[PDB]
Amino acid sequence: XXXXXXXGXXXXXXXXXXXXXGXXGXXXXXXXXXXXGXXXXXXXXXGXXXXXXXXXXXXGXXXXXXXXXXXXXXXXXXXXXXXXXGXXXXXXXXXXXXX
Amino acid sequence: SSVPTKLEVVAATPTSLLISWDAPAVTVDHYVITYGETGGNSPVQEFTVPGSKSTATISGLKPGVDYTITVYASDYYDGEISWYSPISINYRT
Ligand SMILES: [Cl-]
Numbered sequence: 001x002x003x004x005x006x007x008g009x010x011x012x013x014x015x016x017x018x019x020x021x022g023x024x025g026x027x028x029x030x031x032x033x034x035x036x037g038x039x040x041x042x043x044x045x046x047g048x049x050x051x052x053x054x055x056x057x058x059x060g061x062x063x064x065x066x067x068x069x070x071x072x073x074x075x076x077x078x079x080x081x082x083x084x085x086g087x088x089x090x091x092x093x094x095x096x097x098x099x
Numbered sequence: 100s101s102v103p104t105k106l107e108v109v110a111a112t113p114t115s116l117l118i119s120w121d122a123p124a125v126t127v128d129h130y131v132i133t134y135g136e137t138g139g140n141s142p143v144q145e146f147t148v149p150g151s152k153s154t155a156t157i158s159g160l161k162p163g164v165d166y167t168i169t170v171y172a173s174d175y176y177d178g179e180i181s182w183y184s185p186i187s188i189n190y191r192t
Contacts (some may be wrong), residue, residue, distance in 0.1 A: 014174055017100070017123070017125075018123070048100075
């Protein structure tokens with residue numbers, strides 16, 4: 001677990017430079033490594049970022065669109081961070097993580 | 100929007116320079132310091148530095164000539180090496 005926005009593995013350009021100073025919806029997530037169960041997130045907003053990934057199936061739930069989803073992943077990131085259907089908003093802070 | 104985020108000449112002689120930068124919170128695989136005359140056509144030199152250092156000495160410069168010093172930082176992850184946006188400065192010895 002951890003919490004605190006995840007922070008698992010790393011990559012994705014060092015998490016966009018640890019969020020690039022922060023703003024918008026912040027972000028977090030992670031994954032990769034030698035597998036890590038898949039992964040994703042990102043975030044940002046005005047100042048860049050993006051990301052995505054997610055996915056899932058095979059009994060394991062998941063999400064990132066697909067008409068909702070679920071089964072873990074912090075309740076799909078707290079329901080998108082409270083909306084944010086296809087990304088493009090939502091989230092709601094995260095960051096830290098060495099910052 | 101670069102890694103490292105700061106870059107400075109800390110000390111200077113007519114032929115050498117001491118440069119420092121702010122290391123990032125993430126793991127740098129290794130740095131590449133490049134430098135060449137701002138004129139353009141004059142051969143750009145470069146060398147590498149462990150991802151654990153945040154300083155480097157450049158020597159053998161033409162005194163009085165304006166060079167461009169660039170520092171790149173590498174990310175290594177999932178069997179792939181990749182480069183952050185670099186940082187660069189102009190300095191006149
Ligand atoms: Cl939470």
